[PDB]
Amino acid sequence: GLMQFTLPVRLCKEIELFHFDIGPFENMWPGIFVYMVHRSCGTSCFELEKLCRFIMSVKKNYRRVPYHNWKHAVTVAHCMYAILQNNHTLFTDLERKGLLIACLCHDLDHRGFSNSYLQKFDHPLAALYSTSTMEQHHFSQTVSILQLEGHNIFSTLSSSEYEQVLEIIRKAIIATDLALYFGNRKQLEEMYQTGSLNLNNQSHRDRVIGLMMTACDLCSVTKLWPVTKLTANDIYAEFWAEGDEMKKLGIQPIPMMDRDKKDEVPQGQLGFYNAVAIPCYTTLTQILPPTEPLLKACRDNLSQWEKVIRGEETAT
Ligand SMILES: CCCc1nc(C)c2c(C)nc3ccc(OC)nc3n12
Ligand SMILES: [Mg+2]
Ligand SMILES: [Zn+2]
């Protein structure tokens, strides 16, 4: 009960900032997550023994892929921590419990392939889940780990609270399907602008939590340029492997996934920042003003990619 996690001073201070990088020391990541749950939720939220066993089983079920890995899970959870800490009074006790766990679990058992590759391969998961294929799998894996003996971090919740928290986690994980993001943001845009956005309307909260999940999931574009640029390499390493696997199925991949077309990456990043990232953080800032640093950092990195194109710097 009286057993706090404390981080070294530079981490203690920087972990509160949106652009925090969790660093290369894997063995500190569980501690960083527990630290974040304790300050965001409380030292009472979870039984430490059960939380630590849950965290280590979650880690075990992330694969050794270049980007969609344990480091991505903890990174996406830290962005959610920063949003919750900068919006103290807007979220319920159950939301704070659920969203950090949802973020940690959102890409469980990812193989580094898109839903589209699963459908073209005719992967069994694509027969079991026709839309948001990988995201229904991630939620399925979350439930599995929660039902291992000693792993039910929610055991002290009531029957109805338990059902509410798993429903928060399910919608939160489904929302990380970027195919659902476009429509979800257009509606939040309309609702905000016509002044009809109501945070007491559960269907409205659902949409806002969905956009927060997109915001955290994309948060590599909100880091300092050297982090953003080095993470882009890992992201494209997965895209090129999928492109290789498309070519093996006798399908020419889109240029984004073709490793012979690396020269088109800078222009592909512009497209992505303009079509997805900037709109995401803009609408998020409108609904939650204290998340403006994410938009500012995203704009700084768009400006860095424009420089790459004008050959004023080369990404190695
Ligand atoms: C599944 C990966 C989604 C994702 N997360 C980040 C941070 C990114 C970035 C920087 N670039 C992307 C360019 C295209 C794309 O196409 C889906 N997804 C991208 N992406
Ligand atoms: Mg995902
Ligand atoms: Zn993700």
Swiss-Prot record:
Gene Ontology MF term list: 3',5'-cGMP-stimulated cyclic-nucleotide phosphodiesterase activity; 3',5'-cyclic-AMP phosphodiesterase activity; 3',5'-cyclic-GMP phosphodiesterase activity; 3',5'-cyclic-nucleotide phosphodiesterase activity; cAMP binding; cGMP binding; metal ion binding
Report the main location listed first in the record.
Answer: cytoplasm
One GO BP annotation of this record = cGMP catabolic process
Tissue localization of expression: Abundant in the putamen and caudate nucleus regions of brain and testis, moderately expressed in the thyroid gland, pituitary gland, thalamus and cerebellum.
* Species the sequence originates in: Homo sapiens (Human)
**The keyword rRNA processing appears for this protein:** no
Please, which domain of life does this record's source organism belong to?
Answer: Eukaryota
Question: Which segments constitute the PDEase domain?
Answer: 1-312
Query: What family does the database annotate?
Result: Belongs to the cyclic nucleotide phosphodiesterase family.
Q: Which gene encodes it?
A: PDE10A
Q: According to its UniProt record, which residues of this chain constitute the active site?
A: 68
Parent-record interval covered: 724 to 1039 of 1055
Q: What is known of its domains?
A: The tandem GAF domains bind cAMP, and regulate enzyme activity. The binding of cAMP stimulates enzyme activity. Composed of a C-terminal catalytic domain containing two divalent metal sites and an N-terminal regulatory domain which contains one cyclic nucleotide-binding region.
Instruction: State if Cytoplasm is listed as a keyword.
Output: yes
List of residues binding 3',5'-cyclic AMP: 68, 269
Designated name of the protein: cAMP and cAMP-inhibited cGMP 3',5'-cyclic phosphodiesterase 10A
